[PDB]
């Protein structure tokens, strides 16, 4: 099951980052590739697959790492990064 099918494609996710705040220390490409799209306020994003949302990004944050840290069971996460990556993150 996919929470948000209109956001399945990387291209559609990138579009939502049109008004991504430049003050935020994480680039839209990286968020889009990790399955996130912009909800439209501040720095809130959601995964099109698991629907997990993240906010308050900090300098050095890695979208895939945070994805695996907070939502280790996302099917998109597992499909893109592999179970070993997830387990490895969880093991920190």
């Amino acid at each position: 099951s996919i929470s948000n099918l209109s956001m399945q494609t990387h291209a559609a996710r990138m579009r939502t980052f049109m008004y991504w705040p430049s003050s935020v220390p994480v680039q839209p490409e990286q968020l889009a590739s990790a399955g996130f799209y912009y909800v439209g306020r501040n720095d809130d994003v959601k995964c099109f697959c698991c629907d997990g949302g993240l906010r308050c990004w900090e300098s050095g944050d890695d979208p895939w790492v945070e994805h695996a840290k907070w939502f280790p069971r996302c099917e998109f996460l597992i499909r893109m990064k592999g179970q070993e990556f997830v387990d490895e993150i969880q093991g920190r």
Partner: peptide
């Protein structure tokens, strides 16, 4: 980052 509370 942190989860958006639901």
């Amino acid at each position: 980052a942190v989860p958006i509370a639901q």
